[PDB]
Symmetry: D2
Subunit: 251 residues, 4 copies
């Protein structure tokens, strides 16, 4: 282990589910982590459940909040030193077709899922470039960045945008020798206590016509691909999509 020796990571939406598993494995591999979320009570308990404040801290933030992004990078620097690693994991879903999406639902989802990923990616490049950090921006971009779902219109838009915007950033950073890589992670269906709050959702998600493995994944499935992408093991990977989906997109 020590696969993230000396790394300093921000993980948005790091207080629950997938983001918390990423935070946990990051700390286990020697990273210092700042997790974000909307609720201090959840966030402080989550940080304490992983490690001590010299390993992991919480910062209250809505990823749609442009000015808060600046305060989050400042706070992480103050705690841990220069940020090397950003996981843009925070996101929301609307369970509507394109046809049935209100303009308010459209703008709310895109504010988090697209604007927030843009704000973090843009600031991350500026803060992490040319510092010799082996810097890595890891953007959460979904199986819904590859295929449509008739009931996730706005979500599909946001995840298609993250997929290709990330390639633009990867290229610019590579061509300018910034020592910043940008890649996307594309989870299939994962058992999150949220999924456990939607009766029948896991069974629907586990049908062979959806997930050929016949079950959904766990948060650590996404944590381990994020460790690889944060570490210098992946120093030649940039501009690429990393899919962990139980076969969903293979059929």
């Amino acid at each position: 282990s020590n696969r993230l020796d000396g790394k300093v990571a921000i993980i948005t939406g790091g207080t629950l589910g997938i983001g918390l598993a990423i935070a946990t494995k990051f700390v286990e591999e020697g990273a210092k982590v700042m997790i974000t979320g909307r609720h201090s009570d959840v966030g402080e308990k989550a940080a304490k459940s992983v490690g001590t404040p010299d390993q992991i801290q919480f910062f209250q933030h809505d990823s749609s909040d442009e000015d808060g992004w600046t305060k989050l990078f400042d706070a992480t620097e103050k705690a841990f030193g220069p940020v090397s690693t950003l996981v843009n994991n925070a996101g929301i879903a609307v369970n509507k077709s394109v046809e049935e999406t209100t303009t308010a639902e459209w703008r709310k989802l895109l504010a988090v899922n697209l604007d927030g990923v843009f704000f973090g990616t843009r600031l991350g490049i500026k803060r992490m470039k040319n510092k010799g950090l082996g810097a890595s921006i890891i953007n959460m971009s979904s199986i819904e960045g590859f295929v449509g779902d008739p009931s996730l219109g706005a979500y599909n838009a946001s995840k298609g945008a993250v997929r290709i915007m990330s390639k633009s950033a990867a290229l610019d950073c590579a061509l300018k020798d910034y020592d910043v890589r940008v890649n996307t992670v594309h989870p299939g269906y994962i058992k999150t206590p949220l999924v456990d709050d939607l009766p029948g959702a896991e069974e629907a998600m586990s049908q062979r016509t959806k997930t050929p493995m016949g079950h959904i994944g766990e948060p650590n499935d996404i944590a381990y691909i994020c460790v690889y992408l944060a570490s210098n093991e992946s120093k030649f990977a940039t501009g690429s999509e990393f899919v962990v989906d139980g076969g969903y997109t293979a059929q």
Copy 2:
């Protein structure tokens, strides 16, 4: 010909370049067309250059204008009867990396390229479903929906979003037997009088490392794939990307 017999089409940004070539070939194939653009002087001249008002008319519209979308469908209905066909062609570009994109540039581009395509797609589904029209929504989604360009960050975001949002819409329309197809068209570099306004742009675009054919395309190259997608010839095509790029994405 008569490949678009009885079709009624809206083409956004139809007053110039690619949109005007689509309008021209649509009228030649028997469609009735409403073209949109921002400037009445350009739009009325463009409509008259193609045909008489019983074939083609102009409607002044900014595709980012949600309320104007409703007036545009109403006007087209009043002129020509129920709309069967929508080409979401209007778009803008910012020549910035993700890193160098201002929030104002980001929001301006996404308002046209993403929100406008959403507004048109959403309204088109509601207006064209269940009428036996052989309805077709054709969304302009770029080579920049497949690959990054380090100087087109916001554009890449918008075109990745259009690519996958369109698949969501296609699926919902198919599963609900709406008789609406949704597909994307992905131009490579095309000689538009705008390109002719950027000295050196066509030569840059024609380098074999960019366009393997060693030259860029013309507006009619995009018009002909749009005729196919508007016609009942393509009644089994939905949720797919149609690329006309001189080999750009093949290498």
Copy 3:
């Protein structure tokens, strides 16, 4: 119409189903056509059902037969003049998983589906380059070139190979200014009298979890995309995949 004015086309497996529909629409659009198949009785009747020998003829050929490819181009030249257009449509399927595929089944399928497409593409480039024909090689490359099917192991291999081999050919022809385009067509499930010979196959193929439109296509669905790709309308399209699948790959 006259969309294929002056074109001279070879269509392998042109005596039945999809290949015959391509032949029919090619002749309707002004092409001269040589169809191939294994059985003279079927082939001569098929040619006569479409038109007179000044429009369409039959040549008996197994697409796996390298030497016969040379005789087929010679025969087509003798009938109609220089060949401008090749549709590599002939193919076979084995209904086996990778695990359950015999080496004999593997080699038999690849001989037709991969070697035959290679032989035709390679000879087509040599015969059609630098003649000002607006030459077009159209290779049949399947939805099974994009996604796996657990019961089509060898077929998936062959169609993935055709997909990317075609891009190599497209690039070389473009870079060398050969005036030859190479593209792939990717049918979803199509009602062929063969499908009509497999009880339950069409219903299985029409389930929304397979084809979101809830029905399969017809041979003319593939004929019309092939007309576009054969015609000079598609003179800027090369190295690309054209999918006509009822939404199969969109989910």
Copy 4:
């Protein structure tokens, strides 16, 4: 570390370059490894350079040799116990366009790159299914499985075939609860002593129009993604492509 605790791996072409780096990192992570290659002198020295015979051994094999595949699995079992992990890395290249590829060159390359990967994948499924091994088949499938190169016609065919054949295998194994995953790894250009034998090749490969990072990768870049895919860390990944290419395919 111990990320491959208890795993037993076969790595074809494991005596040199990328395959040797995969072998090295596999042994470092606790796997037992059988490397293959054509030359015993190279292979025995390679095994000894990594570890003792209780960690790593060599088996002389041409991956095109169907019967030798059976002897290789038997030998690995005898040395180390049941095989859990197969890396189909052996491959050759022909530096020819499709047009200029001889039939002999075509068949020679496909025998190694396609038939050999098929033989190994097919036998691996049969030997590793239903044993609770957390089994993983990792097939080498190239950037040339995603994009064409005008001078790699047969190579492009083989790597497109491996890409999609692997998805078929992944699906069948998932649906049948075999406890076998199948994934592809897609290197960009990597500095191998072979590349060092082609004067000017690395510089050509490092041009920003080819590899946006402006340099090529090293063998360990491919070793680390293979460790991830062999380990139980990737137990929810199957049917997917893992690209490590310095940005080559992102533009």
